[PDB]
Design a protein around this ligand. Structure first.
Ligand SMILES: CCCCCCCCC/C=C\CCCCC(=O)O[C@@H](COC(=O)CCCCCC/C=C/CCCCCCCCC)COP(=O)(O)OC[C@H](O)CO
Ligand SMILES: CCCCCCCCC/C=C\CCCCCCC(=O)OC[C@@H](COP(=O)(O)OC[C@H](O)CO)OC(=O)CCCC/C=C\CCCCCCCCC
Ligand SMILES: [Zn+2]
Ligand SMILES: [Zn+2]
Lengths: 54, 295, 241
């Protein structure tokens, strides 16, 4: 009956399902290492600067 | 020259989208919390283009040159305003009576936590709040202990601890300042806000993990009352408050509490509309046109 | 033709900002509300320089055309799906019994309010909703009437009645259509939120005015419970929950 979804409402929703999960770092790591490599790629791909201006 | 900025904006948005991308599934299908610390990487990556790796139309840059500077200056103010408040706030506190301490300890000894953070009382602000400085300060009004049989102490106290544990109040400050210099890309503000929601969710988990289920129900009910009693605040961006945040629901509650019984004399609308209209007429007097007219 | 795009956007934003100043100040300092109807005039203004009445670029122009076309098509699709959702709800509704009618009568007895709008019930949804069609339909859960002591009925009825009185639902319908077509100026979409925000506030003012001071807190408590104990849905985003 609330006008629209917001924070108080979201919190109450989560209160209904116990988060009985072992949220192992395994997953975050997989993403984090992937992510980092992509920034590496971004670098080879593109850089520039004004230091060139002889 | 500002071509660099454009490059910067693009890089930022790239990583930004990447994180947002993953999140959906991780919660939607697996109910995982994403450990928010990952977000610092967006900033880093976004700024890589500034490194001199080495391995007319530009009038606009003559201008963008100072847009940067001005924004920083304004933000310097914004930031400091809050910081100064914190100066003020901190110095007004006091330590506590043993009996309260005994109660407090009874609640929390179970954790036997790393007590290198601090508990103190207040004679000022209505709701308990927290911020960092270098000490991890938890501050709560005296009315709550004088009301020794309030019971809700059981839950309120723990909540604050939960913010203390991940050092939310530390990161927040740093993050803010750093972002201020890179004032150029509004997406960073999305992030500035977004991060908050996660912190609060985690805090709720934290609490539930320390109580019964019968109690869960009770707790949830107590939160609602904790929202009810007062107007909210935005006093310290460099802090976390208790009443959740600026919102529609809250605004409506505030108004219903206040008297609201009067008509404004009709002219106000009669004229505001006339006014608006004449001006658009004027706008038109000079401005109109479309390509079909171009024989 | 880029020029026309630009003009339309600019014109709209000009007035838009003007209006915002007024509302803020007027409420902030003198405690008054403005009747939201004025907002239609922003759409109008935005389309004046637009009509062909005077009283490199090639690429830019070509693409702009294409985007306009697609935006309208997809928003319409979204809108239409919702529209039949509404059809569904109507089909499934039913009238109430005599005593239930008698309860309504009591609540509205001294109100003697216009009866050219309709009150009906269904088991389909956990909380009441309303919509327009042309008949002003108020729908409540069929599970509520039997509760001899809910003391919700009183408040729920006035709340909705009040919404019905101002024909707010109609305005949203048409209003949305115009933004469906003029899909590109983000400001045009944004104003929708403002309309809703106030529409509900105003409704509350109405209700409070019809109840005892001693129960003001009662009303408020129910408002909270109405949220606390329920899941959220927005299938009909064109309607009020
Ligand atoms: C600049 C704005 C300033 C105003 C802010 C002031 C207001 C401050 C706002 C702060 C509070 C947040 C309120 C929440 C509102 C909201 O809808 O924003 C949500 C993001 O939605 C988007 O994906 C869209 C968000 C982006 C907004 C624009 C909409 C368009 C999106 C399409 C972009 C995708 C295309 C990619 C290419 C981008 C390159 C340009 C919030 O994220 P989350 O809660 O994690 O949801 C998870 C979701 O289930 C997971 O699905
Ligand atoms: C891209 C070109 C744009 C050209 C225009 C120049 C501006 C560019 C700079 C952009 C960022 C500035 C951010 C400030 C926004 C101005 C609004 C502004 O001044 O509004 C501020 C606030 C609060 O309104 P208030 O003053 O209390 O009066 C409300 C009154 O009762 C009733 O009135 O809006 C919200 O936070 C509610 C937003 C709800 C809408 C839904 C979500 C999307 C977020 C809205 C944001 C929408 C996103 C913005 C997109 C235009
Ligand atoms: Zn918190
Ligand atoms: Zn309503």
């Amino acid at each position: 009956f609330n006008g629209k979804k917001s924070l108080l409402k979201r919190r109450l929703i989560n209160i209904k399902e116990a988060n009985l999960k072992k949220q192992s770092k395994l997953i975050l790591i997989f993403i984090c290492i992937f992510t980092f490599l992509l920034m590496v790629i971004q670098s080879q791909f593109l850089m520039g600067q004004s230091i060139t201006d002889y």
